[PDB]
């Protein structure tokens, strides 16, 4: 079959930077190529048909070249709408083979995360169960460190993390960490705490509440 | 218009047979230069394709996967057909059709229309339908949101005020939890003055088990506190 090889796997440029995403084949596919735009959760938008030509209502910026095995898609300046997998693909052989897709991430300027934190519902409490909620919103670089304390007892094993990904308007990330607890073990404690470590804060920040205690 | 819509189980067991649909309008497959195609991308994984049919019922199919593939149409019906047998857990995938058009003409843009996909997940386990909890606010912004535990199998789709508020909304990627059923949470921002005045419902829908919930997100209360 037809490899297709892209490089960089993955890539951090910021906005008004010149991108240029490579994509070599094994063997000759003319220019029967095609390179896709897929944001996550989506399925794959068509940025160029044919290696070279532009697809009806694509920015100007997007641009592609190559003959033969040696491919390029050059973004002339990158933009926060960018942010996407961006995927080679060709259509000179059955079967269709893609490239391993190249992953670009915005870089933007520190953001600090808004941290908030949510006691179990009395609906879950209801049901027997307790679940603490600790938000991270709205935040940039990814790298973030989140800790619980119960009853200023550092927990683990017992929490789950959720990023999303990069926003396409203002580049940040968002983090949601869950920590889960049965009914009998949540009335067992009173003060519960997230600790939010980041680099865009000056000092670790803290949202906590005490149980029983509105 | 151009559609083009996956339809399928999104549960289906280790050894038994994967069926997919892909329902079109707007063009024929009866119409020369015309095809359909099928192509799968594991979570965070890369595009693959699997096979595709021509107008004239030429079969194309993957080779590696070709023992197990079998592809067909219904040009009456604008509707095309993947089988998929011996399903295995590495076959947890989305799995999208795409259509072709003026074949191997200056007019063939390649594969330029797309459907949203179906997630199929090959797996054992019960279908289980979530819970839905609120996540209550409480003057700057304020955060909100709702919690959808103990679901399976993915996915859970999730709006608020049916659409009409997306501004500030964050849906969290579905965590694995320990029992083997998933959870995730989606929150908004929202200025503080709004919570008296603006509603705020949460729309989840876990269609794998045919269950939807409409759920008021309400600032709490210190009364009732036992």
């Known amino acids: 079959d037809v490899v297709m090889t892209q490089s960089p796997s993955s890539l951090s440029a910021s906005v008004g930077d010149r991108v240029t995403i490579t994509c070599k084949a094994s063997q000759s596919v003319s220019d029967v190529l095609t390179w896709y735009q897929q944001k996550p959760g989506k399925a794959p938008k068509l940025l160029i048909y044919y290696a070279s030509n532009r697809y009806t209502g694509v920015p100007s910026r997007f641009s592609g070249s190559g003959s033969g095995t040696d491919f390029t898609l050059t973004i002339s300046s990158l933009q926060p709408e960018d942010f996407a997998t961006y995927y080679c693909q060709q259509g000179y052989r059955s079967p269709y083979t893609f490239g391993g897709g190249t992953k670009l991430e915005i870089k933007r300027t520190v953001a600090a995360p808004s941290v908030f934190i949510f006691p179990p519902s009395d609906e879950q409490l209801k049901s027997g169960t307790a679940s603490v909620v600790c938000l991270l919103n709205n935040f940039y670089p990814r790298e973030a460190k989140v800790q619980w304390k119960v009853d200023n007892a550092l927990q683990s094993g017992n929490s789950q993390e959720s990023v999303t990904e990069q926003d396409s308007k203002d580049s940040t990330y968002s983090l949601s960490s869950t920590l889960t607890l049965s009914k009998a073990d949540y009335e067992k404690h009173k003060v519960y705490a997230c600790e939010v470590t980041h680099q865009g804060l000056s000092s670790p920040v803290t949202k906590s509440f005490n149980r029983g205690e509105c | 218009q151009i559609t083009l819509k996956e339809s399928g189980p999104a549960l289906v067991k280790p050894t038994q047979t994967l069926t997919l649909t892909c329902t079109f309008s707007?063009?024929?497959?009866?119409?020369?230069?015309?095809?359909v195609g099928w192509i799968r991308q594991p979570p965070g994984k890369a595009l693959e394709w699997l096979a595709h049919?021509?107008?004239?019922?030429?079969?194309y199919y993957n080779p590696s996967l070709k023992s197990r593939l079998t592809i067909s149409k219904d040009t009456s019906k604008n509707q095309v057909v993947l089988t998929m047998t011996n399903m295995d857990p590495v076959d947890t995938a989305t799995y999208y059709c795409?259509?072709?058009?003026?074949?191997?003409?200056?007019?063939?843009?390649?594969?330029?229309?797309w459907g949203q996909g179906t997630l199929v997940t090959v797996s054992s386990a019960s279908t289980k339908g979530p819970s839905v909890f609120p996540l209550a606010p409480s003057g700057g912004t304020a955060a909100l949101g709702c919690l959808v535990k103990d679901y399976f199998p993915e996915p859970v789709t999730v709006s608020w005020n049916s659409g009409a508020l997306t501004s500030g909304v964050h849906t969290f990627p579905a965590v694995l939890q320990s029992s083997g059923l998933y959870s995730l949470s989606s929150v908004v921002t929202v200025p503080s003055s709004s919570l008296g005045t603006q509603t705020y419902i949460c729309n989840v829908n876990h269609k794998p088990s045919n269950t939807k919930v409409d759920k008021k997100v309400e600032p709490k209360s210190c009364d009732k506190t036992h």
């Open positions: 049919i021509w107008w004239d019922d030429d079969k």
């Open positions: 795409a259509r072709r058009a003026n074949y191997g003409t200056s007019y063939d843009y390649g594969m330029d229309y």
């Open positions: 707007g063009f024929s497959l009866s119409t020369s230069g015309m095809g």
